[PDB]
From a paper:
We found that ixazomib inhibited the peptidase activity of 20SWT against Z-VLR-AMC. For the ixazomib-bound 20SWT variant, we observed distinct density features that fit the inhibitor in the active sites. Consistent with the described inhibition mechanism for this class of proteasome inhibitors, the boronic acid group of ixazomib is located within 1.5 Å of the catalytic oxygen atom of βT1 to allow the formation of a covalent bond. In addition, ixazomib binding is mediated by hydrogen bonding with the backbone and surrounding polar side chains. The leucyl moiety of ixazomib sits in the deep non-polar S1 pocket, where the isobutyl side chain does not reach. Thus, the binding mode of ixazomib to Mtb 20S CP is similar to that observed in its previously determined crystal structure in complex with the human 20S proteasome. These included the catalytic D17 (residues β6-25), the N terminus of switch helix I (residues β49-54), the C terminus of switch helix II (residues βF87-Q98), and the remainder belonged to regions in the immediate vicinity of the catalytic triad and the intra-ring β-β interface. The binding of ixazomib to 20SWT stabilizes an on-pathway conformation that closely mirrors 20Sresting.
The Mycobacterium tuberculosis (Mtb) proteasome system selectively degrades damaged or misfolded proteins and is crucial for the pathogen’s survival within the host. Mtb 20S core particle features homoheptameric rings in a conserved α7-β7-β7-α7 configuration. Stacked β-rings enclose the degradation chamber where active sites containing the catalytic triad of βT1, βD17, and βK33 proteolyze substrates.
Residue numbers in the entry:
A (entry chain Q), B (entry chain b), C (entry chain R), D (entry chain a), E (entry chain S), F (entry chain Z), ...: 1 to 222
The structure:
């Protein structure tokens, strides 16, 4: 499992793979690991699948409940605090074998400068959170390879297309180096999933663009 | 790791993959797991790499030493006994984490009927050996999937080409179902390795034929 | 124990065996492992017998109770959520030796296209659920052999008869490869049990058809 | 695994099944578990396969070595003592998971009365031996069912044919009650193996007679 | 301890022995292990004596309480459910050394066909219940020998006398093979206890008939 | 297991039962537990069967070897010392589950008074020996009941017949109170075994006398 | 600790850092971790310092001893075998906390093509060795970051200068990502150490070139 | 992690580093570890990050809550007591791996002499607090080196500038001796953070002054 997120001038882009394994046996081929929490926020959780889906559905319900009750949406710090509390509450279950690690991406509409409005937040198993300032982050078992690839490929990002290409390349490198991460499937036609957040909101990326980018990358590497 | 062996009218064919892993991290991409022990015998070992290479080199040296000392090669039962003794001697090291499991294929020149001269022998961790009579066998972590594929694909085998195609298809299915088994690599150009034993001896299969068969299988599955 | 389920154009078919064992001793010969929960849903549970019957009776009562209380039946997602909650609640008892794993098959009447209305859902020990998209699934100790047989026999399915024949063949292969699965009994006259769900509801398959199919398969293999 | 032995006026008959299992997985279908040690003695060992074959080959070599050295064969008590010593020496390996339990059948040529010359000897894990006086014995995991069947079917034995039929029926009952024992296979054509010892020596029973007896028993039970 | 139950055309018959032991020391010689719960149901419990008597007295009180409260007796399925709940509630005490295993026999007055109205129900340590369809069942430490004897002696049962004789013979065989089961005592005059249930209700069998049957069986075996 | 020995004016008498058990399962019905070591000494061993037979055969061989080497038999104290050394050497194997406890009876030919020449010696698990002076001793799991019966029945002993009757009665009481001790079998015709040692040597008692005594005792108790 | 090795047309280059730590405390600032074993071979060991120096001095002495004894140097395979034996012999000490992992670089003078004569060999804790075919390798705790940097920077290598620059950059990245690896020190003037092997032999790189390259890299990153 | 605090005539100065590590891997480069609790008090916590932020936010909220409720701020002893209670309450979580150790600096406005109004308070894991009287204190894993540096550099402190320079030098020495402490970064431009408290309140130090001081110190050491 590997989920990447990065910033471009105008917003953020988040991408994730589709492989689910049970030890060394492949169990799932088209799992979706990226969710749209609200109009300007996306979350990606790694670890036990059931805990991840439960956390995602609970977080979405809590945000919607607050928005309906108070008539106004929460600020970014409030959402970070709620997610940190949810993560901290699972420490006892995080031990003994039910662990979930989230990653958050968002667009701040209250920021003075619209260009620097994209935010990426990472979390730890004890509930501590950190706001990234380097422009990219990765979570999962193949996060080190993806981070090392982005460290070299980040100079090419100029807009959304460049960032999406860099994210796909990082996922490809992570799948190349890790056996628990699923690479592109050309026999079946399964590709990673991406979400792009900008001033107009959060939109899912169509699969044709990702397929074209993956084919171009595969041709380049060959 | 998955090594398959099967019989065709005239001889035997053995095939193996090339992936080496350390947990969930990929460590080796072009490992060779099939050896030619002598003019009419091939061996394939699964498990710890160092133990496998040590076992193979030791077995070859022992066979050559006996042949040079006595002026006549050993019979098939003698080779089986020597391999079983070698396996039985590693029981203590097989426990605690140094395990090697071999599979043997051969052609008997003393058999009355040259058609039914191919032999396949399997071994267990305690040193017990079994001579196969169904026509195929597989060893490794993905052996169950390969065996289940051969159970359905064995009716098509008529000669060496048919058997080689069936072996490649079984390896492909094993790699599809298991993450510790390496599939064909078209970006890099790495394919499984095969050895064919018949009345003229044991010969390594050139990589072009295996590449053609793998491409045909991939096109068929797509 | 092995329970299989598969999709055909028009609906779904689920099949199960009849053997119950206590270690290596045979305890039961005509156990029924497939239940009709409601007019359009079937469930099959593997594991401890008492837990399975308790889970089945409880699930049926809960569905009927909701239908009577609200005057309208639940949707498919609601039933999946209820089953997942029931499975998740038994985690503590799943450890230490009281484990039950269910498999769900159903027909969605709210789907726009009646042809693609059959659904198959699998579950894990932690309460996570997955909706199948390949067309078949198996649960139990012999599920791997049945899945590997269906992977090769799925191209022949065209209607209900073809699917039933494929399911019986998969159960036969699972019983051939596993000793904890009961095969057809011709001395006594005991055969697996099947349920077919289509637009008209869920119907139990009469035993004469299954006996004829099993006899044909046995004759073919001989 | 189940091996039976019984006495008839004129000699002894020993029979055994052909199933080999690894837990709940079937590993072997045509294993031979009955050996002819010398001209008037047969042995059947249950437990770990490798230990059983090693014990059998060692016992045969020791008997032949003594016969060649001294120019005269050993008496029955000497053979019993040698087998008991061999069993007693494996106590340490019998613990921790390498256990072999033998059963011996023989014809005494030094007995005054040729009619009462058949002997059956059983052994325990500590090396103690017992000479049977009831006329039948069984070893293995399904020995209780076979013994209970012979207790009722022993009144019909008059000659070799009657004893062979009773032995086949006892093996059939043991396979009916135990899942680790292999029953007759009519799809493949595999049947238990039998050895008959009389004043002329020890002879293997041809498979046609056993197939006919098994078919008759199956027809009777149906 | 061994309790047997079997079906004959017209009803059911249940029988039990009288030995109570504390390790290898004999503690009781005339213990009664079969109870008449109501007008058409009998129960026999094996295991710890105190738990068995407590379970029996509690079950009888519960059935009588329901009958008095509702003015109508429970159906057979309700009684089975109550007994299963009672057994399931003792799982924690079943572990660590307070185990009780029941067996139930009854006559259904609501059945359409009076001939096939006898029912035999067995239970497991986790609370799972099974309805027998072969015609006989045994519980206790000597149940295997009794079952194997009934498997051969069931063809002679035609009416109540035949069934009672078969039950006494099965108990005799169980006592012959097991040392924890008490056989007939001719020095003291103590014999097993039996209960016969038919359309007129459940009646205890007088001891003279059982003594005559036991004497006849002993004479036959001598 | 219970072995009794007692003194009468003129010599000694030793008796033993014939039951062999494996837990609560009966394994042997006609085991012989009393041996004649030499012309004036008898030994009876209780515990593990194999250890007992090994000890007996070894003791006999050692006594014969000394007699042949030195040309003169050992004295009684020397035999006691040899037996005590043999018992002491098995202490390590006596722990962990291989225990053998002997009892010795003999006639001293060097005693001044021929009337008081019978000797009974008992041993403990550490190798300590004691010479009895009360006139009787018992070994085994039912030794307490036999000793308590002899304490009351010893006043009737006058000669060999009286002592034999008392020994049979003590064995009968031990079998009555203990389930691991075999009583007289009238269906099969198996009775305890006795040895009588006097000035003329040690003689085995014929079975007819023991059968008559057992029948008389059974009639008296009835 | 991080040691890198890579191939360029004409030979090989190996580089290593200088930090030694004891937990989180810095103990050494100018440790040398790269040795020249002979005229055409270099070795770099990571792990416990004392074991590394002992292994290096022993390997050099063994190679020199063989060269002096036989009058001819060993071949490359012989050196690999000797190093593998030395590593395998320390398995017991490798456990419990004395671990040393080597990496070997060399130039083969017996190769037909002088361009492709550079060899890089890696080893595992059990004694297994692998010959690299991708052109670079890294060992130590920061090996993953260095490998990921070389995977992107390898396309620039054309000659010795390019390879040395790439090696220094990889070491810089490893020190950036790992706290147990020492980076360039400009206050003190301490830089990594490098060895270059080509057709003329193995030569140590002067520190001025490495200082210039490190200053250029630092200026580029700033 | 290292946080230093010291006194100068007129007030106090507190400084801290910016490195966050996870074992031997660097995780954070610009972490802020010094907080302004109120107008005259600063706190610095070392240990687990999440616990530190939670403690800081809770302490600030508690102080503000008391000030708003009572209309008057707490005295210094009251704040010390509240912090000690908060530390004491985490003892159970301090064990097993969630430890936080604070350090407090403040200016007392109720002191008679404004010159000697700066206070430094240290705490232990059990909740005990100590008021420093030597003029400086350090907390963290590199506190010993910083304390030993201040012991020699304290004679130069005359005003705020001297104290700030001494604090930066102590942090530099701690980073030199400890690998878990971050030193000045000139490639990226990250420097430690400082807070100065005097009669006018608590003010954050601008980064330009700290950068100038760090550059001067680095030039001096070179
Ligand atoms: C979203 C999620 C797929 C993340 C990934 N985790 C897993 O796949 C872990 N796997 C299971 O939880 C699991 C899945 C099934 Cl089907 C059965 C049993 C188990 Cl144990 B990842 O690589 O980190
Ligand atoms: C021939 C052999 C490759 C067989 C296969 N086994 C392994 O790959 C096991 N792996 C290692 O031994 C190993 C390899 C390295 Cl590079 C480092 C550490 C370890 Cl621990 B297989 O899949 O069964
Ligand atoms: C529906 C159910 C039969 C499923 C199957 N499970 C079992 O048979 C497990 N067996 C028992 O639970 C059990 C049965 C009895 Cl009669 C007594 C004791 C025990 Cl322990 B399967 O193969 O997975
Ligand atoms: C002669 C012998 C077949 C007797 C029987 N024992 C076994 O089958 C036990 N099985 C193995 O030893 C064994 C066989 C293989 Cl192929 C692989 C691993 C193992 Cl662990 B029996 O039922 O008692
Ligand atoms: C109805 C009952 C007699 C059943 C049987 N169980 C027992 O006899 C077990 N025995 C005791 O519980 C017991 C009896 C006494 Cl007197 C003292 C101590 C103990 Cl521990 B059976 O064979 O299964
Ligand atoms: C002479 C001897 C029969 C004495 C008696 N001991 C035993 O019977 C103990 N039993 C066995 O040793 C034994 C017998 C067999 Cl057939 C199989 C396994 C075992 Cl474990 B006694 O009651 O003290
Ligand atoms: C060549 C060698 C420096 C390699 C490196 N290993 C170490 O530094 C380990 N450290 C010690 O062994 C050690 C050093 C001292 Cl001064 C005192 C105690 C210890 Cl325990 B590396 O990073 O892998
Ligand atoms: C304020 C705080 C940074 C103090 C320092 N502590 C730590 O850095 C400890 N580290 C973590 O807690 C931690 C950080 C992350 Cl990103 C992930 C996992 C863990 Cl486990 B120090 O050196 O004492």
């Amino acid at each position: 499992t590997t989920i990447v997120a990065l910033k471009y001038p105008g917003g953020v882009v988040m991408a994730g793979d589709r492989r689910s394994t049970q030890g060394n046996m492949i169990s799932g081929r088209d799992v979706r690991k990226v969710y749209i929490t609200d109009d300007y926020t996306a979350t990606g959780i790694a670890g036990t699948a059931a805990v991840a889906v439960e956390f995602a559905r609970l977080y979405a319900v809590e945000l919607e409940h607050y928005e309906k009750l108070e008539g106004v949406p929460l600020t970014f710090a409030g959402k970070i605090n709620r997610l940190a509390i949810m993560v901290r509450g699972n420490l006892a279950a995080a031990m003994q074998g039910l662990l979930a690690l989230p990653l958050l991406a968002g667009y701040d509409i209250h920021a003075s400068d619209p260009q620097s409005a994209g935010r990426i937040v990472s979390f730890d198993a004890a509930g501590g959170w950190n706001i990234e300032e380097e422009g990219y982050q990765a979570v999962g078992s193949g996060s080190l390879f993806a981070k090392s690839s982005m460290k070299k490929l980040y100079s090419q990002v100029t807009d959304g297309d460049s960032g999406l290409r860099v994210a796909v390349e990082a996922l490809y490198d992570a799948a190349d180096d890790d056996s628990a991460t699923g690479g592109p499937d050309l026999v079946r036609g399964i590709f990673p999933t991406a979400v792009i957040i900008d001033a107009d909101g959060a939109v899912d990326v169509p699969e044709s663009r990702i397929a074209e980018l993956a084919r171009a990358i595969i041709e380049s590497r060959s």
